[PDB]
Amino acid sequence: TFGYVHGVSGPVVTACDMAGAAMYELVRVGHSELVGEIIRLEGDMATIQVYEETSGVSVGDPVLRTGKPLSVELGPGIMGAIFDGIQRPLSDISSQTQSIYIPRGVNVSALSRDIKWEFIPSKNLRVGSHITGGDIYGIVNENSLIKHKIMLPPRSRGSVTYIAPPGNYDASDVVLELEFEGVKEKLSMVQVWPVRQVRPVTEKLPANHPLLTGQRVLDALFPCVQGGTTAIPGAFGCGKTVISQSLSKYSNSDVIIYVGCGERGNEMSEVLRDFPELTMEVDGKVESIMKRTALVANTSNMPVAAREASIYTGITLSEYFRDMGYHVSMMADSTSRWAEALREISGRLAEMPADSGYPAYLGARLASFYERAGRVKCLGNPEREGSVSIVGAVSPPGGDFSDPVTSATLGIVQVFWGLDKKLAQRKHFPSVNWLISYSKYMRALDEYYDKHFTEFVPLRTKAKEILQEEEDLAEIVQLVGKASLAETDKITLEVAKLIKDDFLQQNGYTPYDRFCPFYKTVGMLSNMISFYDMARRAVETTAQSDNKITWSIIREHMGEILYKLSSMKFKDPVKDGEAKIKADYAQLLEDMQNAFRSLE
Amino acid sequence: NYLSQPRLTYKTVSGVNGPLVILDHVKFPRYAEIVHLTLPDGTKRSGQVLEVSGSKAVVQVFEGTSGIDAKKTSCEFTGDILRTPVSEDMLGRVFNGSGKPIDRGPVVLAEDFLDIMGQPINPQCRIYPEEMIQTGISAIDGMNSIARGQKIPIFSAAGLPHNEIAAQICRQAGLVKKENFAIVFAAMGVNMETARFFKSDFEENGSMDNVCLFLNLANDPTIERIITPRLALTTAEFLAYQCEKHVLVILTDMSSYAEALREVSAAREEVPGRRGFPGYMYTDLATIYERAGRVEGRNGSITQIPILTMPNDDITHPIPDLTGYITEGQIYVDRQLHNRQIYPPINVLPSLSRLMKSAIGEGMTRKDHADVSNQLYACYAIGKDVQAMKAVVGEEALTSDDLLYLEFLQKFEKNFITQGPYENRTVYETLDIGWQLLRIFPKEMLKRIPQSTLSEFYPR
Amino acid sequence: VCLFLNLANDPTIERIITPRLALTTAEFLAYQCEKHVLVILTDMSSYAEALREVSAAREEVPGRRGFPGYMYTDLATIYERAGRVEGRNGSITQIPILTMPNDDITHPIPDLTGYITEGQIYVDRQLHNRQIYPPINVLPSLSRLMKSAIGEGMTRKDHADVSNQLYACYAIGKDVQAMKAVVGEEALTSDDLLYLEFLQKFEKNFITQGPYENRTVYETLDIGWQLLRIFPKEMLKRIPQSTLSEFYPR
């Protein structure tokens, strides 16, 4: 059952009578039961890197091996929970101890027992029925938003020998029993899964459907697919909270997981204060987002292993909800803090440095983490697709993206939303830099846009071209002044200003811009680019004429259209239905057509 | 309840190696157990078990191993880890880095024996920082105001007066007065004259009753310098989270602590990490710096101001680099202002209090503060840009607006930043100086201040 | 075609055997079955990262950037399994592929690969950001075996000369572009403006090509002369007078 401590040196504890141990198995060391991971075996002895502070551990103290590597207790009771990176429940540690601290060597179970949840067994099952890994043997109605699909562990299979009737159960009541090769498994609602092992699936599907954030720049110019991998430069001035809160208040995702990889203590507590108070509309009710998120929060002084395991816990939770057929999203508030934790582990393991002091495996640890994103056919029989979208923020020192964790992340992630302090200093919320930013997902989402938004492919192209042309034209404006540009270039710059001021900016602090649906977004852009095409047409059509058209003529004779175009952002989906917003936008199209027809 | 069992004393020293005495035949040693050594001449020494293996215990002795003797040395094992003899009576008092008193007062009558290492404050029980601490220094309070519960370093360099700034903060620091404040002044690696300055300046210049002062001297044994922040923070946690105080913890030079990590790492024979410091230096600095913040259900809080001598004047160095990842901002002390004889030489431009926007404003200070600080930053930044333009164009080419910004820079350095070491300015007296400077511009030039704030505060 | 796939989440040590399984299969197909095999090895960078991981875990001696001191030998065990052999009709061509870390041509992965493989084709953000597909920057590129694979029976007799003059004009174009960015187009001579017009026409016509557009070598050399003809005959200092007399006016 347990070995004995033989030696100690900082976090490293050598233990004896460990003959039955396994590499990377998880152990409770000392009478205080400090958590530690076996980093080496040397016969009847193990070397355990204790995560927590080892001060006071004694030779001959017990060393209880848990039969498992670092693992997440999955089940009902996740939603709204806050955990540290090794999956300890921070709300329960506080409420059970009545202390402000996390005690050294907490034993508290991560999904609280003695809470009873309403379980419904899946009504088709019977004694003698065949069942396979990922089959849903019931549902737990824990929240109005999220119904937890209880399912067979991925490695389990067999013939059902018992199923619990509809009723109230805690996570350790036996809900299902089944037999295979003459051996019975008794299943709890809690399911334990190794945190560094990918949860398997029937198929890793191509990602094709957009993760609407409700943000014009993001949802139009740099879409992230559901199942997509993306990064944000998480820094002071950038406004990283805007995407985080917008995803929370509106996103096309069913469950959201956050990971704090070792945030600053106050910044972590700002996030943990805010999210209980955030709300979203559901079936015409307004409800707290804590009904559909879980927070894997660590401060910079949590054990190194909690910071390094933080992403692996967050993704293992996210894969668990993905296997229920929920379209999960998740964020890591800085993968650089996770890479500092990984660097420290590596320094304590005494491994060779690679680039900038980071371990050799940093690139493969990042790439194997981001590869756990995607859309999938889940395991088991109910033919359910799910996904995990991963929003891993990066914190390049001084903004230098060549930094190994940032550079490797940007080498892997298919979308970069380049938030920029210069835009935030101009109050250009959401502060996304459209020159630095990119998305690789266009080629997939073009199927969705061709089916549902067939005008958008031209519009997206024209918008990016107008913005790129304005960046070149601004150098000519500096060289020879705005008045020296050609009429085509002047109207391009004026429309680019309209896009920058009243499309790419979005006042998320106010009801009309709190979210911006795709039907609103495409409609606004359809009008701005229709104005561009007709204005530039009138200019080029009247080239070499006596009565030449120019931006000043347009502003004088039909400046009401520019005023209306800037006004279109103020339409509110909560007041006026999308059909009414689209009809008003169609009236602005007719108004500008009649105005251009009045000139040429 | 407590350790009822009698202490073992061992003569079984199997070796000595630099700062380490290697006991053998030890019965069930603890890692980091404190031990009391007796030399052959009867001199008492202290040490802590640095490593254990079966019957062996590698004691890191505090004082140097001069006089240790494998045949006649004896080592009394305490059975326990290091505990602070903590109490509220540590305010008004001066301790050396071990926690032994040096103010000629008695030993501390402990209210509890808290473990020096503490435990992590639960992320769920932290609460966001929300009210200012006045430091008394205008270049901090009116430009970089410190939210109570913030961590904010004073980045400095060898030769700069950061110790005088830290002592001035300790004398002047307090709540805003729109009672229960205290300072813990943990001083590490202090040369003997700077230790006389801290001890004597706090005694003479009207401060002791609010402050607990730890003095680890430059030549005090290095592991006592490692203990000193843990010892001080354990006191600050007692005062803040049990006596409900608002504590300010000042750490006087984290670079001399970082040098002590490097030495204690080499004592364990760990391989040197990034630029010779331990790989885990980030976790150790977090273990110091994160013993800070407000907490839910308690009025008390710990602010921290880690002073930090940047090696080679370079903020890229791992000591300031890792500090900048953990602390909410920085304050920069600048050799340019110091050579210009501007005291305190705090450069308000590369300084940034990350939480100032939640320290100040209506019901926390005066409601103008956020606007005044943003506009003072703009007028100083533009005035520096104009001094760099005057170098090129010559004074007659400057516009009237440029000449105002150049006069603002002269007066801002001579009245706002310049303060002197015994002048204490409330946030209100600092904002009044802020206005009497901004009042140099035409009202329309104050573009970073709203017209409402101007109509209330621009009229003199 | 045969595919060996090691995905990003598959165990990193398999990367070391993955290109060896591919080459072992290619040796069977190309020497036992005498096929012309083309071997494509994708992200030799991820192979070299697996070498760096193993050495870091074994504590083997580091060369540059922590890669194994023997990395050239290990890459040679992969890359030298290429080429024709006596009495076999078959052949193993290889096109390794690698992401250069931080764009650094001097990095150990592209450097040791550059010392083993015969020539390197380079692709560049300085072309791709300007939408120039395929983004092949000729200037740092070179094919060591090209000198033999061109001229009569293989390609037109001009090819060896035309290639070297395209390099001269493209390179001088980059050099006068670097001058223009300091001194402006007023300091450039009429010939320096022609090297800038060459650079523009070269990237637009010679490099840029559709993903399903196929161009013969002969069509490529015709486009080569349609660009070299921008300069007066006497400027073409890499080409022989006989080659100019046969091909410059055509």
């Binding site: 060779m352 | 040197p272 | 504590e59």
Partner: peptide, 23 residues
């Protein structure tokens, strides 16, 4: 780092040899 890591390994090997020689 590599030199110092090999030195620390060689010292560990010397300790192991000494522990065997004490048999």
């Amino acid at each position: 780092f590599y030199r110092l890591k090999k030195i620390q390994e060689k010292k560990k090997i010397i300790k192991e040899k000494s522990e065997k020689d004490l048999e």
